[PDB]
């Protein structure tokens, strides 16, 4: 909520910095098997239960 | 860059000054990283700071060692960190103790060595 | 055949140990033989490959071509050779990822810590 706690604002910040796609220069490395970011998250679909 | 075997020849205050004249550099490069896309010179400065602090600390620890030589109790940080069990276990002397009866028996009737033939 | 107990005849373990080898073991897997003149001069058969070594190719579509090394890509287990390249469709050029076993060293990037290696291996100047 608005009147929240720092223990939760921390965990929301982490989720904000995690919510991005994959860097395209990872796909150019040699023995690469990562196509996309399979751990993505958005508020519509999956709630992080904290 | 900066190098340990050059820094060991330097003293406390010189290294303390080198730290500051490196941290200023790092603070400048952290500005240039904004107005530029990439600054790899920054890594050498971070590792330089670390190589400096390492030397400072090691000097200071050796000092306290030389202070605590012979004194029976020296700090836990300086004491050897073997495993808890091997610090709790018996000393080589404490374990090789014997009763007077047993050492008399050992000096009188030791395990002779021998062989089977005429 | 093998007669010890601490060495493996296991395909799985061996291939793992190849494809997860570090860059310090790969230096020796990426070794190459010397030409029949340097075999006679330095007195050895093979050495690990190094940048700025001149070289000749003996097996491949680019046989007979000579060059000198520009990069040992010891993640691809490969090696790249000057005067040995391929023009991409863009007009640009990309070098060839050779493998050292299909090469022959003609001139050597001599140095201290290689003269020593040659000396311990029973070689000469």
């Amino acid at each position: 909520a608005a009147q929240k706690s720092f223990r939760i604002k921390q965990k929301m910040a982490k989720a904000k910095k995690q919510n991005r796609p994959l860097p395209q220069w990872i796909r150019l490395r040699t023995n690469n098997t990562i196509r996309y970011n399979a751990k993505r998250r958005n508020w519509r679909r999956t709630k992080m239960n904290i | 860059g900066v190098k340990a075997y050059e820094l060991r020849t330097k003293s406390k205050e010189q290294l303390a000054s080198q730290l500051v004249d490196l941290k200023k550099e790092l603070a400048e490069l952290k500005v240039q990283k904004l107005s530029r896309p990439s600054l790899p010179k920054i890594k050498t400065v971070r590792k330089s700071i670390a190589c400096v602090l390492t030397v400072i600390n090691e000097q200071q620890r050796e000092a306290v060692r030389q202070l605590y030589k012979g004194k029976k109790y020296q700090p836990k940080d300086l004491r050897a960190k073997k495993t808890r069990a091997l610090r709790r276990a018996l000393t080589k002397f404490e374990a090789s103790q014997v009763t007077e009866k047993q050492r008399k028996k050992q000096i009188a009737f030791p395990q002779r060595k021998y062989a089977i033939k005429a | 055949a093998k007669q010890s107990l601490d060495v493996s005849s296991d395909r799985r373990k061996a291939r793992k140990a190849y494809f997860t080898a570090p860059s310090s073991q790969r230096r020796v897997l990426l070794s190459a033989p010397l030409s029949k003149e340097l075999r006679a001069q330095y007195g050895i058969k093979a050495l690990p490959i190094r940048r700025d070594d001149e070289v000749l190719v003996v097996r491949g579509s680019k046989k007979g071509q000579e060059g000198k090394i520009s990069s040992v890509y010891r993640l691809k287990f490969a090696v790249q050779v000057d005067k040995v390249t391929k023009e991409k469709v863009n007009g640009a050029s990309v070098p060839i990822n050779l493998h050292p076993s299909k090469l022959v060293i003609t001139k050597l990037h001599l140095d201290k810590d290689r003269k020593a290696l040659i000396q311990r291996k029973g070689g000469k100047l």
């Binding site: - | 060595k113 021998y114 062989a115 089977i116 | -």
Partner: protein, 49 residues
């Protein structure tokens, strides 16, 4: 059941016997261990039997 002219046969597998099973694959792998131990001891006590 009891079906034919067969012996009465007593077989003690009503407990969880499958846990308390020991197959001795170790027979030769540890015969050699015993031999090595004898051989080592015998050199520790080099002239003694």
């Amino acid at each position: 059941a009891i079906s034919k002219n067969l012996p009465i046969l007593k077989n003690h597998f009503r407990k969880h016997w499958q846990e308390r099973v020991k197959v001795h694959f170790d027979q030769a792998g540890k015969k050699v261990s015993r031999r090595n131990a004898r051989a080592t001891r015998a050199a520790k006590i080099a002239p003694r039997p």
